[PDB]
Design a protein around this ligand. Structure first.
Ligand code: HEM
Length: 396
């Protein structure tokens, strides 16, 4: 019995149980998008960014009244995206992430210290959710003493810098984004002050590296840097906590694999990777056709919206043997969890670091963790995001 069937996870998604359409590409008419379920097809689509573009503004109906989030690279197309990515990736580096490990462990310990010994913890509220927030804030020059100032802004930040948002958008939803954005002057004055400081007295940190990022002299403006930082405050945050909770849920569902993983911590990252393939926080990606293109015998007209169901592609039997089986030992595990191509997830090594550190400490602190049917795991309502929003676990 899989983790999906145990908790009746997203019953709307049949591919979560191996029920797949015969064709990889199936046009909807609802819902006027082209759904892609196949692994080789998704790979082809993701690699061909020219044919399958990422800026969908011209493709959205006037019913979609969405505020454009400044600096959002995922909604951005080349050549501008290329320059923006070259620059941001000059700063957001593997070395900077790796150097954060001790800090991540220290934050993780403090969080676990608060609930150590309790007969029941809730994984999201106690660990999975606060950790990515604090970690990314410190990377952006937010000192500990200013945590109360950021929990204060917590709600407004995420409404104001979440972004789009095709499947889940509503009129009232976008309305909320606008209102939050109207109350963000003091956050953007906050970031601007730290950017001005890093340009004045440079440090070995992210904000400074964003200021100094070069590529033949062509740099980011202070305003673009502030926008990059504010976006980073929320991008990957929710998905990171989902990923943390999803891994534990997959492990709970199979006590023998859980025991094996606890015994052999070298399997932790693999268990995290496998959870991303099994329960995808980013289940759906949107692309726009720039021309008429044939994908697997299916002709897609120009200016059509393609929905890449990465969760389904992650279960394509052509690519994955026993696709419905959570197996942390899969090596390699070329899932679509972080995407593929010029838009490949930038925060992936940070996500993987927080995951490995948090998981190992959780197992260390709590030798026994089991779900409660009286307090069942809940899930995000969204169709494009497959992750837990709450976990209740027994110390037992
Ligand atoms: C488990 C956690 C995460 C998952 C599952 C995830 C998922 C993804 C996916 C699927 C994409 C590709 C989007 C596309 O092709 O349109 C992406 C891109 C991106 N990610 Fe993540 N993400 C995670 C964490 C993070 C974190 C922690 C950060 C930064 C602190 C981050 C920053 C970004 C940015 C800036 C992009 C856009 C890159 C571009 O468009 O060139 N992500 N993410």
């Amino acid at each position: 019995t899989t983790v999906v069937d145990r908790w009746n996870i997203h019953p709307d998604h049949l591919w979560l149980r191996g029920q797949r359409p015969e064709s990889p590409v199936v046009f909807d008419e609802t819902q006027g998008v082209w759904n892609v379920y196949g692994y080789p097809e998704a790979m082809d689509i993701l690699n061909d960014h020219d044919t399958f573009t990422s800026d969908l503004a011209h493709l959205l109906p006037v019913s979609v009244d969405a505020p454009l989030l400044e600096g959002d690279m995922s909604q951005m197309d080349p050549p501008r995206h290329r320059k923006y990515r070259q620059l941001v990736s000059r700063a957001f580096t593997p070395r900077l992430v790796a150097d954060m490990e001790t800090r991540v462990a220290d934050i993780t310990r403090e969080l676990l210290d608060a609930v150590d010994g309790k007969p029941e913890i809730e994984i999201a509220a106690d660990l999975a959710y606060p950790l990515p927030v604090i970690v990314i804030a410190e990377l952006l020059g937010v000192p500990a003493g200013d945590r109360d100032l950021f929990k204060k802004w917590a709600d407004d930040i995420i409404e104001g810098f979440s972004g789009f948002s095709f499947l889940d958008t509503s009129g009232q939803g976008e309305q909320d984004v606008r209102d939050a954005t109207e109350r963000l002057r003091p956050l953007l004055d906050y970031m601007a002050g730290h950017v001005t400081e890093r340009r004045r007295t440079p440090r070995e940190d992210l904000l400074t590296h964003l200021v100094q990022a070069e590529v033949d002299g062509e740099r980011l403006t202070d305003n673009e840097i502030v926008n990059v930082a504010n976006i980073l405050l929320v991008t990957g945050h929710i998905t990171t906590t989902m990923t943390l909770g999803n891994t534990v849920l997959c492990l709970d569902a199979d006590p023998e694999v859980a025991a094996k993983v606890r015994a052999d911590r070298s399997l932790v990252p693999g268990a995290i990777e496998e959870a991303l393939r099994v329960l995808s926080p980013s289940a759906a990606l949107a692309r726009g056709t720039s021309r008429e293109v044939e994908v697997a015998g299916t002709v897609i007209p120009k200016d059509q919206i393609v929905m890449l169901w990465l969760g389904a592609g992650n279960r394509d039997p052509r690519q994955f043997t026993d696709p419905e089986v959570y197996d942390p030992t899969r090596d390699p595990n070329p899932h679509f969890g972080f995407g593929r191509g010029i838009h490949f997830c930038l925060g992936a090594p940070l996500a993987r670091l927080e995951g490995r550190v948090a998981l190992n400490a959780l197992f260390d602190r709590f030798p026994v963790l089991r779900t409660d049917p009286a307090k069942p795991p809940t899930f995000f309502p969204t169709p494009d995001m497959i992750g837990v929003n709450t976990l209740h676990l027994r110390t037992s």
